[PDB]
């Protein structure tokens with residue numbers, strides 16, 4: 001931050017980049033939450049092993065000596081669901097979605 | 098008519114110093130200070146102000 | 147901090163008559179004549195000043 | 196793929212699939228969609244939810 005009058009170095013800011021709506025949105029709360037876990041239930045679980053399990057139990061991955069997955073690619077015909085899925089799993093972890 | 102214009106710009110980030118970084122439409126980005134009519138609830142990053 | 151902002155130019159051209167065309171970082175170029183602290187021996191092309 | 200008359204209109208279509216009902220909640224839309232055939236429309240508009 002600088003004083004505009006004379007270009008004086010006032011106080012060093014936060015580097016904070018330019019995230020506006022971009023990253024700021026965190027929604028994971030209802031409608032879609034962890035009482036919408038009716039599926040397609042193996043497909044939801046796969047997400048949990050990949051994602052929640054290294055977050056919550058990060059140490060199991062050391063014991064075995066692997067890395068956790070880098071991503072869970074959900075795809076399918078529309079409406080069947082994958083908006084579903086992603087949001088419930090996020091709500092359970094409660095992290096930076 | 099002689100009352101002045103007020104500058105529209107869009108909120109880049111929120112500073113936790115009581116300040117708001119606003120990326121103005123001017124071209125520069127300005128660090129500006131809140132007023133009593135400003136509150137965190139109605140601000141968002143993406144807030145025209 | 148209050149000091150007049152010493153704007154940066156890059157010796158974009160030079161002349162043997164005292165004048166040195168500095169492309170200023172504002173956008174445009176200026177032709178300015180250098181002080182007695184700095185000399186035209188010190189001013190080579192590519193020299194940020 | 197490898198068109199611009201039927202590529203670009205598909206990446207603004209992919210945006211729609213996905214904004215009209217997507218991530219974002221609800222509100223009060225209720226989007227009234229209107230069309231002349233369902234025989235040259237994407238199967239996501241065609242289905243309910």
Ligand SMILES: Nc1ncnc2c1ncn2[C@@H]1O[C@H](COP(=O)(O)OP(=O)(O)OP(=O)(O)O)[C@@H](O)[C@H]1O
Nearest residue numbers: 038039078079080081082083084212213216239244
């Ligand atoms: N298994 C499910 N049970 C109930 N509701 C579901 C289920 N799967 C999806 N839905 C709901 O169906 C509605 C419409 O589907 P949505 O657009 O969310 O899906 P998608 O397969 O991720 O889509 P697109 O391909 O269009 O991006 C939503 O309200 C969503 O929560």
Ligand SMILES: [Mg+2]
Nearest residue numbers: 082083213217
């Ligand atoms: Mg979807």
